[PDB]
Short mmCIF file of C-alpha atoms and ligand atoms in Angstrom, two decimals:
data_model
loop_
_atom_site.label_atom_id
_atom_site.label_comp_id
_atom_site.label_asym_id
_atom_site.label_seq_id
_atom_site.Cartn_x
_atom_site.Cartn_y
_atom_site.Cartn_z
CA UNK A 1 0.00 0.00 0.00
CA UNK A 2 0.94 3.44 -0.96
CA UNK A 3 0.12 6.36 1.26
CA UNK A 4 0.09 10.16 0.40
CA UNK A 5 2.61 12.06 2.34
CA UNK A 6 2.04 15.43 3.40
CA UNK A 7 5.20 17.80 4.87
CA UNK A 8 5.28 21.11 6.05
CA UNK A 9 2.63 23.68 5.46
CA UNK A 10 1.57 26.93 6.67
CA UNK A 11 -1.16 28.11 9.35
CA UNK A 12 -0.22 31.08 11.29
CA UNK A 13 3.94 30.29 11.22
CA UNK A 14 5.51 27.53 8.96
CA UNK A 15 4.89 23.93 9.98
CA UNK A 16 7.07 20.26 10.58
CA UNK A 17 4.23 18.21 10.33
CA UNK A 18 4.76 15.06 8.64
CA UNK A 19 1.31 12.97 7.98
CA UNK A 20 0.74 10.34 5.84
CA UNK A 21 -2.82 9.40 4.55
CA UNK A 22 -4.57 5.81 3.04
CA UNK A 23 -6.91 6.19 0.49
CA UNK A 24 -7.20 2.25 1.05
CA UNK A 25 -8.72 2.75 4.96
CA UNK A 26 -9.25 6.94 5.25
CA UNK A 27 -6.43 6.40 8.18
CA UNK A 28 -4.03 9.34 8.58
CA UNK A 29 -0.49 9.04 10.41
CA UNK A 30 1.47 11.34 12.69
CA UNK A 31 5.23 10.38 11.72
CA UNK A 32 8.77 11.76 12.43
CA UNK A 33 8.48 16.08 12.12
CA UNK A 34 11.23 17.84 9.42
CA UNK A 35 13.66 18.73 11.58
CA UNK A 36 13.32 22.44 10.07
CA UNK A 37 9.29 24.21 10.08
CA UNK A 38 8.93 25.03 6.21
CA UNK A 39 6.03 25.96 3.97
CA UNK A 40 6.28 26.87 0.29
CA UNK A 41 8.38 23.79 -0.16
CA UNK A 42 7.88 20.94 -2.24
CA UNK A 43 7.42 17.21 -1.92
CA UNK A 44 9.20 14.15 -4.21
CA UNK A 45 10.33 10.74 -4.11
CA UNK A 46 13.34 9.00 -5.80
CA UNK A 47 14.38 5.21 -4.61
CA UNK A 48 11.24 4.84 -2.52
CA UNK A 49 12.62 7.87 -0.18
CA UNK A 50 10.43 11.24 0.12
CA UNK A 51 12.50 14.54 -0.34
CA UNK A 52 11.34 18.17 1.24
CA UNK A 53 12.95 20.78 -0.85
CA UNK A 54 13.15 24.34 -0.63
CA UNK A 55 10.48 26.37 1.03
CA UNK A 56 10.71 29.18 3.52
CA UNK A 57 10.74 29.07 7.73
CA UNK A 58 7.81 31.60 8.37
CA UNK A 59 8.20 31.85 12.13
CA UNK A 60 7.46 35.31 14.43
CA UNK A 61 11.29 34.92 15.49
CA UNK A 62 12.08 35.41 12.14
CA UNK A 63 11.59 34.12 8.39
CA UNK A 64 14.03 32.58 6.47
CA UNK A 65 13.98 30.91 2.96
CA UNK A 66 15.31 27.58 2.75
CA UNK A 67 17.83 25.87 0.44
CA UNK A 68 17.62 22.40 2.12
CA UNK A 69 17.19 19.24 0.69
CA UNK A 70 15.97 16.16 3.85
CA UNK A 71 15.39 13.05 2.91
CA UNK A 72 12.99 10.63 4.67
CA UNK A 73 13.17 7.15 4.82
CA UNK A 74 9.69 5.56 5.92
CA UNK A 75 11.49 2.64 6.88
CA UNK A 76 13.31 3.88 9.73
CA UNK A 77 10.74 6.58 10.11
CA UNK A 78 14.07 9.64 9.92
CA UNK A 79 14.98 12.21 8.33
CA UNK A 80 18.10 13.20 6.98
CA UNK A 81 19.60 15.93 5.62
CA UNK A 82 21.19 15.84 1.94
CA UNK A 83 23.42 18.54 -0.04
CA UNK A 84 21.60 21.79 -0.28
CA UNK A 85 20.85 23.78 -3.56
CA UNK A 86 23.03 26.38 -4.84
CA UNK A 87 20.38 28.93 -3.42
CA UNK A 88 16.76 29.52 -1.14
CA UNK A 89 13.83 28.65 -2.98
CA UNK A 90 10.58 29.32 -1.23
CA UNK A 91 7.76 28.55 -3.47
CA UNK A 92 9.58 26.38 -5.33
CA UNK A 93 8.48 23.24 -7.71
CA UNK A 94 10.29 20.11 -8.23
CA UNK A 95 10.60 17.03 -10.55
CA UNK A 96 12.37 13.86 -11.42
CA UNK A 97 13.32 12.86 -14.13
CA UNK A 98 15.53 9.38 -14.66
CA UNK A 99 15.81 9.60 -11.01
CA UNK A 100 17.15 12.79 -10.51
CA UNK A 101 15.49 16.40 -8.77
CA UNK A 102 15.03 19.12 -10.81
CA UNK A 103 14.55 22.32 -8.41
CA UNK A 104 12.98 24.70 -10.41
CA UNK A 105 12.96 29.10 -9.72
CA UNK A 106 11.25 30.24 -6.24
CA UNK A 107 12.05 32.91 -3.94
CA UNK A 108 15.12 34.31 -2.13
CA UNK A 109 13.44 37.46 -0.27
CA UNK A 110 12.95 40.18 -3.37
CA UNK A 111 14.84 37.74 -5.90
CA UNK A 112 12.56 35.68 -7.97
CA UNK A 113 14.49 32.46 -9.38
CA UNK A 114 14.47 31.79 -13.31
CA UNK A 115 17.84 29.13 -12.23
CA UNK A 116 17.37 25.73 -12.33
CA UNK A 117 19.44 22.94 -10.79
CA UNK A 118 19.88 19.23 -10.56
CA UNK A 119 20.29 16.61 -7.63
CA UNK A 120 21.47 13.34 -8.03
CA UNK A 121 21.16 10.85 -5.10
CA UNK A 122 24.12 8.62 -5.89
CA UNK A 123 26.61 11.56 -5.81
CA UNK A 124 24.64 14.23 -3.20
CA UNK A 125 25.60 16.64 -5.26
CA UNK A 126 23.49 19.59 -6.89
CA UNK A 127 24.51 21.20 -10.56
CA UNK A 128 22.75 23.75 -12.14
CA UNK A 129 21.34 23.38 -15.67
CA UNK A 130 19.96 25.94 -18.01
CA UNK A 131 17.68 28.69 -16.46
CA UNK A 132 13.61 28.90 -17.66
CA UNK A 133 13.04 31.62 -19.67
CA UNK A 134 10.91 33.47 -17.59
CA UNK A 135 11.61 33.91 -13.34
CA UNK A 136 8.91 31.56 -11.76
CA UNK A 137 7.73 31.36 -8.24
CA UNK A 138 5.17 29.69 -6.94
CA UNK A 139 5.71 27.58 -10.41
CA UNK A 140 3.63 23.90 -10.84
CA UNK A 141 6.59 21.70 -12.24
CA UNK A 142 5.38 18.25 -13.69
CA UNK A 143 7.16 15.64 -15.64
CA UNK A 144 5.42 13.68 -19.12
CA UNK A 145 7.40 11.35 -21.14
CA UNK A 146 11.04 12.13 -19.32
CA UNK A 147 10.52 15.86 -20.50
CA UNK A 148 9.85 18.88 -17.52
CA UNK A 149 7.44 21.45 -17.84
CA UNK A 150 6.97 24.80 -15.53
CA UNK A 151 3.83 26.30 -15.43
CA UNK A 152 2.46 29.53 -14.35
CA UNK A 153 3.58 31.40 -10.67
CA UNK A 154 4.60 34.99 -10.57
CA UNK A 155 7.46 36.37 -11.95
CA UNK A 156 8.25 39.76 -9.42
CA UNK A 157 5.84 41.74 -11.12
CA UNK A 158 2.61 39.43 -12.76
CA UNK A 159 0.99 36.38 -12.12
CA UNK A 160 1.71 34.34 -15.80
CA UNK A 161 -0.51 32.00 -17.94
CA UNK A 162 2.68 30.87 -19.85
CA UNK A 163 4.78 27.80 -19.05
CA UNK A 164 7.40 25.91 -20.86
CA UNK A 165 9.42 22.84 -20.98
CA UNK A 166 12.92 21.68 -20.75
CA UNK A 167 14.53 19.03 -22.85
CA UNK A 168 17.43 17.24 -21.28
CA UNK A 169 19.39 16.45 -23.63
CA UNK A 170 19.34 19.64 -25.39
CA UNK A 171 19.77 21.55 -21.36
CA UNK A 172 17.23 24.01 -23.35
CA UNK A 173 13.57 25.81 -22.33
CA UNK A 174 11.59 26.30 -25.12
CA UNK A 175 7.85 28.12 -24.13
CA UNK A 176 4.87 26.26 -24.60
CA UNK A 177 1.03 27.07 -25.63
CA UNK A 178 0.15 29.10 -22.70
CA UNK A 179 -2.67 28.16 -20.36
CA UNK A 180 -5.96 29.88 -20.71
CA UNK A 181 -5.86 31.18 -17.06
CA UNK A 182 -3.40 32.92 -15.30
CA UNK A 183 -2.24 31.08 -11.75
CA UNK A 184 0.45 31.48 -9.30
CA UNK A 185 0.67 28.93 -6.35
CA UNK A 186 -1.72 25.96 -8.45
CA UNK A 187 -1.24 22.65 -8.22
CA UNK A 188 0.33 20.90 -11.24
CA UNK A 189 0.82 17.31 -11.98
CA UNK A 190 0.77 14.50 -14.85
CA UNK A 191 -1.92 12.20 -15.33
CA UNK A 192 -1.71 9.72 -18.70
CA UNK A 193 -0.96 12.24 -21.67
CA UNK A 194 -1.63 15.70 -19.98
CA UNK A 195 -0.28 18.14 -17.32
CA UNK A 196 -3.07 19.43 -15.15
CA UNK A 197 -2.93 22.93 -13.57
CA UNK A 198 -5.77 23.05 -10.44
CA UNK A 199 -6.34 26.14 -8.70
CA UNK A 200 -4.05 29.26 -8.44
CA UNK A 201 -4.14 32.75 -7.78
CA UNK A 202 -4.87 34.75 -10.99
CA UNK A 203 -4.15 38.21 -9.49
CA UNK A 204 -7.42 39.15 -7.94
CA UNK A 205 -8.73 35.82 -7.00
CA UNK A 206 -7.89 31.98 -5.91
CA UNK A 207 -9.35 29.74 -8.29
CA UNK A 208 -11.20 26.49 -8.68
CA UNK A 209 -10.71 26.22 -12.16
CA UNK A 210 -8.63 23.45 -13.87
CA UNK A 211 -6.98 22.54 -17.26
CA UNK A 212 -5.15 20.33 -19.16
CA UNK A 213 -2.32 20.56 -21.53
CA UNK A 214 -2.22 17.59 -24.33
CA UNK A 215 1.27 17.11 -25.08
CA UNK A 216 0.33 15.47 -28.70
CA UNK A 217 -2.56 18.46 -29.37
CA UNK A 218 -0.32 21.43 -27.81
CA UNK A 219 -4.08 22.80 -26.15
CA UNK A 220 -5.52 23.33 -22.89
CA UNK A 221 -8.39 22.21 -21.98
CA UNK A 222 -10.67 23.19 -19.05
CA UNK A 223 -11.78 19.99 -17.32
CA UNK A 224 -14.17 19.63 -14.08
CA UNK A 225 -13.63 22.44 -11.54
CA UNK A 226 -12.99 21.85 -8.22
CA UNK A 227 -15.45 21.81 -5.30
CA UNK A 228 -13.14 24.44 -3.60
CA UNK A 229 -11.55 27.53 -4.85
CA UNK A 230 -7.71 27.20 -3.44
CA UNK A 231 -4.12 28.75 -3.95
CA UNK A 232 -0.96 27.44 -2.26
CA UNK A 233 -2.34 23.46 -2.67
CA UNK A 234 -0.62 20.59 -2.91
CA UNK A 235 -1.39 17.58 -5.59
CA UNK A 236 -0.37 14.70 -6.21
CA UNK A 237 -1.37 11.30 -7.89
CA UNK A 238 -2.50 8.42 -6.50
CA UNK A 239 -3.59 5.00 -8.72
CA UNK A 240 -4.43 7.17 -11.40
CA UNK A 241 -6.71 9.90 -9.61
CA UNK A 242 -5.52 13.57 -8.51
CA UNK A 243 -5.30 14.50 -5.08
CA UNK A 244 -5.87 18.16 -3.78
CA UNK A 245 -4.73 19.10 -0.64
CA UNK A 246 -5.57 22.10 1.44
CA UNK A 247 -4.90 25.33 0.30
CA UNK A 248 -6.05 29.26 1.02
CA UNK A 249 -9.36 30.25 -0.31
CA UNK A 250 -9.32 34.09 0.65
CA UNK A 251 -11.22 33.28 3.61
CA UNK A 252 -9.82 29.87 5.35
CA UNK A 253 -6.53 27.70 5.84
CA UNK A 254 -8.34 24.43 3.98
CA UNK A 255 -8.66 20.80 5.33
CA UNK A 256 -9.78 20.36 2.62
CA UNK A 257 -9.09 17.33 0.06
CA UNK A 258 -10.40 16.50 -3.03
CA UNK A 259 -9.91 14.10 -5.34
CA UNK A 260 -10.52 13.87 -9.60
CA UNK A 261 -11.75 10.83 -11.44
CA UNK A 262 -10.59 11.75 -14.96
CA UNK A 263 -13.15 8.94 -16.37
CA UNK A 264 -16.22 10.49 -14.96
CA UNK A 265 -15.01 14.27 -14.98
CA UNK A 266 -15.54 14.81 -11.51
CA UNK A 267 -14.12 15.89 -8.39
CA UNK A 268 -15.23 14.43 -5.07
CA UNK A 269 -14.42 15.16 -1.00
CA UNK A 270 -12.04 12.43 0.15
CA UNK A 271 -11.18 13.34 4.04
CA UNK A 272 -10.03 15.89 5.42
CA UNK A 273 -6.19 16.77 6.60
CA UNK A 274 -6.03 16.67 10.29
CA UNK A 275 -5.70 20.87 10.49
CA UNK A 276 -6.58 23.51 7.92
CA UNK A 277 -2.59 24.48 6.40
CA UNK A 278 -1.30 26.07 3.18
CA UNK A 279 1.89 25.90 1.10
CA UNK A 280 2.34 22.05 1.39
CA UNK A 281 4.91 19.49 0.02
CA UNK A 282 3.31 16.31 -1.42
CA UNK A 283 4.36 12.74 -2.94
CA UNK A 284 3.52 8.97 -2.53
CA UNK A 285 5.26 6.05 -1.48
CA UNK A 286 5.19 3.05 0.75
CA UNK A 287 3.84 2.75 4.15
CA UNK A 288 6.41 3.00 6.92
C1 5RB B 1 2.73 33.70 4.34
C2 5RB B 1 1.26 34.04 4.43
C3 5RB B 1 0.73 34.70 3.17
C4 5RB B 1 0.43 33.72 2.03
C5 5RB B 1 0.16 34.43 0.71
C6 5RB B 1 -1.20 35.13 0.72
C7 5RB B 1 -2.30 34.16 1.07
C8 5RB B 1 -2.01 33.48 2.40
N1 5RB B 1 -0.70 32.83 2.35
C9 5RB B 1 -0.57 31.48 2.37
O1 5RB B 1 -1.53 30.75 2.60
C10 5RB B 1 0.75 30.83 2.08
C11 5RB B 1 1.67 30.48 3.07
C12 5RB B 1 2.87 29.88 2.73
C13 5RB B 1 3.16 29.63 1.40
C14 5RB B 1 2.26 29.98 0.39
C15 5RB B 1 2.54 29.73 -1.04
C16 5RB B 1 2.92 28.47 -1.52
C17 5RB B 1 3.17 28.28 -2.87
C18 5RB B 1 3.05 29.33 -3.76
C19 5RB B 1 2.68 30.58 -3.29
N2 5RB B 1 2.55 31.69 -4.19
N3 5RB B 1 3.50 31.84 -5.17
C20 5RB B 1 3.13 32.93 -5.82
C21 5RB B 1 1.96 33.50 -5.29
C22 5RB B 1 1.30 34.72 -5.81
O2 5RB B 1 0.70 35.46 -4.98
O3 5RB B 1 1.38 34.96 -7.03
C23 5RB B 1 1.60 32.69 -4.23
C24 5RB B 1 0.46 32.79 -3.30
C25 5RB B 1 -0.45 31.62 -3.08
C26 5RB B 1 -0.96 32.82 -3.82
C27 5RB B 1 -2.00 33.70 -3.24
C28 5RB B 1 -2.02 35.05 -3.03
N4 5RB B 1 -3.21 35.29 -2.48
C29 5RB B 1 -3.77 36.56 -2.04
N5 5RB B 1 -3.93 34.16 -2.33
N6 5RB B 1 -3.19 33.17 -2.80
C30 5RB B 1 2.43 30.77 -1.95
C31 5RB B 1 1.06 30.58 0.76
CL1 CL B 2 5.82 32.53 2.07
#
């Protein structure tokens, strides 16, 4: 059985929880707390182990953006740290590809990221690669057929529709058909042929909205929306369905998850987290 790990998060200051949830019994699991609070940070796994990456320490004796990479093992139930990136990157998105972390833009205080770097577990060693072409925070990262695509965030001054991908081999970004909504802070992930972008802020609003980019059509399409509107959410997949997970509405720190059944176009309420929390990390992998 696979659970859905959830790590950090933000309600009031940054947060260490760690909690792991069953879609096969509803159960949820308290397990070992990052060693570091962090929200804005995002979740992955490589070799069966979950990473935290990047993020931001919002605490009232002080904030401070975080370059760390911690690895947890769920069968020891620790975490350890790993090399950390060239830089802080709150608001940061991650993916592997060929079993390697690609930590994509984020924030450093006023500095919005367009860098780009590389981890590789065998060596513990970060490298940069080619920058985006645009500076990204708050950027859904997904990977589709071994290729990595950035979508959205904010860029210091607007909230972006575009996104783009990155080819290894050719360590080049090349844009892509923009999405037909703008959204910082959605949740993006892959599910068969498409990259779907959940939720956002668009500038004036958080969103329920959601779309899908065909890789073989080059369009996005708007699918189901969401039951709730929510920014700052994390998302993952899960035998083939999305996952949602809380969020900011304008109004309320969201327990909230969802989950989408891409057969019948719909989304449906799963459970809900064990508090309200924004600003999430997110990934599956074995029970502990
Ligand atoms: C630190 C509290 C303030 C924060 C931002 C305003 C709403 C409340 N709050 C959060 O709950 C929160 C906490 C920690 C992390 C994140 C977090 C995570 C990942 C991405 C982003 N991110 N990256 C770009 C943008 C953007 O503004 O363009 C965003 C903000 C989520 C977007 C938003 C703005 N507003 C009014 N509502 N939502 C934010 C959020
Ligand atoms: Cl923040």
């Amino acid at each position: 059985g696979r659970l859905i790990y959830t790590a950090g998060g933000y309600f009031r200051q940054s947060l260490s929880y760690l909690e792991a949830y069953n879609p096969s019994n509803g159960s949820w699991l308290r397990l070992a707390d990052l060693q570091v609070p962090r929200s804005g940070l995002a979740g992955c796994v490589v070799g069966g182990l979950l990473y935290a990456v990047g993020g931001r320490n919002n605490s009232p004796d002080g904030n401070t953006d975080s370059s760390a990479l911690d690895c947890y093992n769920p069968m020891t139930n620790q975490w350890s740290p790993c090399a950390s990136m060239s830089v802080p990157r709150n608001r940061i998105g991650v993916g592997v590809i060929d079993g390697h972390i690609y930590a994509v833009g984020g924030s450093h205080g006023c500095i919005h990221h367009s860098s780009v770097e590389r981890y590789e577990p065998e060596r513990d060693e970060w490298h940069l690669v080619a920058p985006m072409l645009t500076r990204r925070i708050g950027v859904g990262v997904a990977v589709l057929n071994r290729l990595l695509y950035a979508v959205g965030g904010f860029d210091g001054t607007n909230r972006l529709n575009s996104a783009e991908c990155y080819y290894p081999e050719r360590n080049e970004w090349r844009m892509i058909t923009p999405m037909n909504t703008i959204r910082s802070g959605a949740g993006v992930c892959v599910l068969h042929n498409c990259i779907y972008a959940a939720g956002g802020y668009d500038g004036q609003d958080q969103l329920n909205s959601v779309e899908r980019y065909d890789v073989e059509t080059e369009t996005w399409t708007f699918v189901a929306p969401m039951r709730h509107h929510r920014s700052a959410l994390g998302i993952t997949v899960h035998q083939g369905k999305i996952y949602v997970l809380g969020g900011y509405d304008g109004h309320t720190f969201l327990d909230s998850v969802e989950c989408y059944d891409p057969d019948s176009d719909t989304w449906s309420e799963v459970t809900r987290m064990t508090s309200g929390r924004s600003g999430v990390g997110v990934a599956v992998t074995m029970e502990p």
